[PDB]
């Protein structure tokens, strides 16, 4: 009820931004082949 609502958009785009900037973090290079 507009105080809870603020709390959800924090928590969503906290973890969504960890997802988005996780695969931008040179993610194909993280393999057991090399580096």
């Amino acid at each position: 009820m507009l105080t809870l609502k603020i709390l959800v958009y924090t928590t969503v785009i906290f973890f969504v931004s960890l997802f988005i900037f996780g695969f931008l973090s040179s993610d194909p290079s993280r393999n057991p082949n090399r580096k």
Partner: protein, 334 residues
């Protein structure tokens, strides 16, 4: 050296107890919220207007249920397809009345299962595995999104969605029979063949390995202790189990290749559940199964009954009785 690189090194580490990964960044917060709301809504949750007629259906344990009858009730017919979060409900009492937690559980479930699926990919990348276990897990993800997401879309309401329970499942299956005739639809036919075939080739492969085990134990200890973990010797005579099934049916019907054998175990169920979950999907938009009612006639023109006409009279019994108060007009358009 940086704080982000020391965080990416931890979150993609296979040296953790459970691999978290980048999909776990939105698997674990989603599925723990679908869990922690499910346990509360299954145990302690007030009754829910499902038919939109202000007749609240009890579904939790504190309101006199058990494991079988208790269920998280779907949302109201009054809401229908509208997004109904907590902050758009003006109180939690108004939220729990109108079928609140069904949308909170389901939407955090389908995000967490579609992230559990991508997490099975990610660890296969970091371990050197060939990647496609997550394609086999697409088959229950197709079926979970068919009864919780796609079928409420094409029917236009989450109230037609599947109730999160055990007796609510059979309320879902029978009402789906009367309104859509799923048993005559060839995609439920192609997945009954998927799980009857799947449980066949499971118990047929699991018996021929256990039949042809090599002597490594005594008769006092267990059969299973003849396998030391991580050994490089083959633990069963595969030529023996090939010569058995090569005589049990005939010679040319037997896979001598164990790789092509262990691929056919992954093909048959998964293709059977992809096809089935696109049976619920095409029947979400009212493209029903076959209808052979009044198909056999004599030369006079009188209807001769078939087995489909007996099956029709079972469908007419469920059709005239499902949601016995919600209807006002002669045709169940919804």
């Amino acid at each position: 050296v940086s704080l982000w690189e020391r965080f990416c090194a931890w979150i993609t580490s296979t040296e953790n107890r459970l691999y978290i990964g980048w999909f776990g960044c939105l698997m674990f917060p989603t599925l723990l919220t679908a869990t922690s709301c499910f346990i509360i809504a299954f145990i302690a949750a007030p009754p829910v207007d499902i038919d939109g007629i202000r007749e609240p259906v009890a579904g939790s344990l504190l309101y006199g249920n058990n494991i079988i009858s208790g269920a998280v009730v779907p949302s109201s017919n009054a809401i229908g397809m509208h997004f109904y979060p907590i902050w758009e409900a003006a109180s939690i009492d108004e939220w729990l009345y109108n079928g609140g937690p069904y949308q909170l559980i389901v939407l955090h479930f389908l995000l967490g299962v579609s992230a559990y699926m991508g997490r099975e990919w990610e660890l296969s990348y970091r371990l050197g595995m060939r990647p496609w276990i997550f394609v086999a897990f697409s088959a229950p993800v197709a079926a979970a999104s068919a009864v919780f997401l796609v079928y409420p879309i094409g029917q236009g309401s989450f109230s037609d969605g599947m109730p999160l329970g055990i007796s609510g499942t059979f309320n879902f299956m029978l009402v789906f029979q009367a309104e859509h005739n799923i048993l005559m639809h060839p995609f439920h036919m192609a997945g009954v063949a998927g799980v009857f075939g799947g449980s066949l080739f499971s118990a047929m492969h699991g018996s021929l390995v256990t039949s042809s085990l090599i002597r490594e134990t005594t008769e006092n200890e267990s059969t299973n202790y003849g396998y030391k973990f991580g050994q490089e010797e083959e633990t069963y005579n595969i030529v023996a189990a090939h010569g058995y099934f090569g005589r049990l049916i005939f010679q040319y019907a037997s896979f001598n290749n164990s790789r092509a054998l262990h691929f056919f175990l992954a093909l048959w169920p998964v293709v059977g559940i992809w096809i089935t979950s696109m049976g619920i999907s095409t029947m979400a938009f009212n493209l029903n199964g076959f209808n052979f009612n009044q198909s056999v006639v004599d030369s006079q023109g009188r209807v001769i009954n078939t087995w489909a006409d007996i099956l029709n009279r079972a469908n007419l019994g469920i059709e005239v009785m499902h949601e016995r108060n919600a209807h006002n007009f002669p045709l169940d358009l919804a």
